[PDB]
Amino acid sequence: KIEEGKLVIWINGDKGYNGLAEVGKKFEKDTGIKVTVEHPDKLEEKFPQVAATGDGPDIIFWAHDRFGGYAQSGLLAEITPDKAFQDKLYPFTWDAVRYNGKLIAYPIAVEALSLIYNKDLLPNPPKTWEEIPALDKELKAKGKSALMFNLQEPYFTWPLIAADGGYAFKYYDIKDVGVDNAGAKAGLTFLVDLIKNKHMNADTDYSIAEAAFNKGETAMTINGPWAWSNIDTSAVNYGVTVLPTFKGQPSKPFVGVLSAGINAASPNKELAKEFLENYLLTDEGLEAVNKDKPLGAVALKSYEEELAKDPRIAATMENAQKGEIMPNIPQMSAFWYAVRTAVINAASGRQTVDEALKDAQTGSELYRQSLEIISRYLREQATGAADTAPMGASGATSRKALETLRRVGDGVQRNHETAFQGMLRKLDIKNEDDVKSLSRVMIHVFSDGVTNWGRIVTLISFGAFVAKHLKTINQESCIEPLAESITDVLVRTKRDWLVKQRGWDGFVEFFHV
Numbered sequence: 001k002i003e004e005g006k007l008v009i010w011i012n013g014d015k016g017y018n019g020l021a022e023v024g025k026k027f028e029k030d031t032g033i034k035v036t037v038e039h040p041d042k043l044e045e046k047f048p049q050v051a052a053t054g055d056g057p058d059i060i061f062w063a064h065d066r067f068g069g070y071a072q073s074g075l076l077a078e079i080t081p082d083k084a085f086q087d088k089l090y091p092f093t094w095d096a097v098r099y100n101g102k103l104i105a106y107p108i109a110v111e112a113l114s115l116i117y118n119k120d121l122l123p124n125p126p127k128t129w130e131e132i133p134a135l136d137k138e139l140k141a142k143g144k145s146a147l148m149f150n151l152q153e154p155y156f157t158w159p160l161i162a163a164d165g166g167y168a169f170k171y172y173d174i175k176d177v178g179v180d181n182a183g184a185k186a187g188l189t190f191l192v193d194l195i196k197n198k199h200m201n202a203d204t205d206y207s208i209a210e211a212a213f214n215k216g217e218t219a220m221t222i223n224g225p226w227a228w229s230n231i232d233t234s235a236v237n238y239g240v241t242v243l244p245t246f247k248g249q250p251s252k253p254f255v256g257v258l259s260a261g262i263n264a265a266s267p268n269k270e271l272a273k274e275f276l277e278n279y280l281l282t283d284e285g286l287e288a289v290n291k292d293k294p295l296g297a298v299a300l301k302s303y304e305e306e307l308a309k310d311p312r313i314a315a316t317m318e319n320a321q322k323g324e325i326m327p328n329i330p331q332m333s334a335f336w337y338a339v340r341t342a343v344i345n346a347a348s349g350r351q352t353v354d355e356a357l358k359d360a361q362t363g364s365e366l367y368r369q370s371l372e373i374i375s376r377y378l379r380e381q382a383t384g385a386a387d388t389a390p391m392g393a394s395g396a397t398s399r400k401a402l403e404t405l406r407r408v409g410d411g412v413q414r415n416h417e418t419a420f421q422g423m424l425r426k427l428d429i430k431n432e433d434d435v436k437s438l439s440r441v442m443i444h445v446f447s448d449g450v451t452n453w454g455r456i457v458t459l460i461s462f463g464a465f466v467a468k469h470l471k472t473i474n475q476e477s478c479i480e481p482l483a484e485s486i487t488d489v490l491v492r493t494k495r496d497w498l499v500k501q502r503g504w505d506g507f508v509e510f511f512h513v
């Protein structure tokens, strides 16, 4: 389905895609291979959908946080640069694109948000979030505003949520989610108060913040290096500086490494490797991209040493040091989807902060909590003995849901025994190969009919039935993969329903005696 003897590249519409296209033409001049650069909308959502059918671009550019999901789903080629090429880029940039001990992409550039301020309106930018309300009252008296930034993407609000102790995954313990802790609450409450007190507008997006800053209407924005080009063109006298503190603590931006992955379905992997290693990741390659839209602190040592004298890059790295490198684990997609919704709902008043972050903590934890319950149930059903290990400090839900599933699922296996035996005989489950096939079937069976807990119990009960069979034919090793597939089916297709029901607390409530 992907065309051979050509390279299609996807990169986000805020990056230097014209610069990338020049590196494309320089690859074409020397090889006669034509490089097409596209910047589709929602490309981080559209990559997994199309790559999963063997389609999409040869090369996908995004921050590293989305690459573990892609690698887990088999969408990316392992990359195997020799040691002489590895030594040309900073090791911590390689760490960002290492997943299960394999390099799954090429690192390009280190991205961190900074505070961007109009030196003509605000010769001394605030050191603290707390002084922005008073500052805004002062600028409003002159027909200006203190601060506008994109409230539609959680990335821009995360530094403030994280300042007083909010976090995604404790360092990575995916059992420890920091989305609804007191630190997160205090950060998002301060944001909502800025909106309530009319210092910010809940509808402000990328375009509105950018235009307001570049036209000199607002004294400050929050943005990455890519934004500096449009500000150069604007003639705004701007500075790039350390983010304001919150409760005396630094803002901690989530740090992204812009990364180039190679489609597993691509029949041009050697051309892609040749383009990325010998044309893009060179002094002339990165300069071409950088001149269009700044990359930040580039992964390439030679060229990073030239750019590091720029005070805007120094400020970028200063914000990077105070932030955290994002996790690349497959949970990150769901974490971002949850926190985006929480910030938008808290900002608009659809939900309170406590409500919004409660829903976001449930969404971020949903996968791991589902798998915990389902894997424990399938294993104990297969072996006749429960798992002895602790459920966690935050897993009282997990223990109650498993108790409910045991009580309710007891009957479902017994009543549907004849029908389960038939369906199992109608499939040929014999090894890990056959378990792959089940997902399509379960999806299709879960794709029609009504969404309720009874049907979820029926699905998991068939899972346990299969786990028992797997154990009988010495395929015990296939139980965890089966449990992952049932979890994947359940979470990927019913996420929004499950968050609505308060996830597994809902399940325990619905069948309470």
Ligand SMILES: CCc1sc2ncnc(N[C@H](Cc3ccccc3)C(=O)O)c2c1-c1cccc2[nH]ccc12
Binding pocket: 416, 419, 420, 423, 441, 442, 445, 446, 449, 455, 456, 458, 459, 462
């Ligand atoms: C992959 C097997 C799966 S996953 C699955 N997920 C939800 N519900 C299922 N079953 C009920 C239909 C049903 C009810 C009672 C008796 C028999 C069937 C439902 O869809 O509500 C199934 C089935 C399933 C299992 C065994 C026989 C089956 N016959 C059709 C589906 C199905």
Ligand SMILES: OC[C@H]1O[C@H](O[C@H]2[C@H](O)[C@@H](O)[C@@H](O)O[C@@H]2CO)[C@H](O)[C@@H](O)[C@@H]1O
Binding pocket: 012, 014, 044, 063, 064, 065, 066, 111, 153, 154, 155, 156, 224, 256, 336
């Ligand atoms: O808003 C969540 C979003 O944050 C990051 O995306 C950034 C990206 O890293 C930057 O390169 C820049 O383009 O802005 C984006 C935010 O709009 C994560 O990388 C992304 O996965 C996540 O969805």
Ligand code: NA
Binding pocket: 042, 043
């Ligand atoms: Na986007």
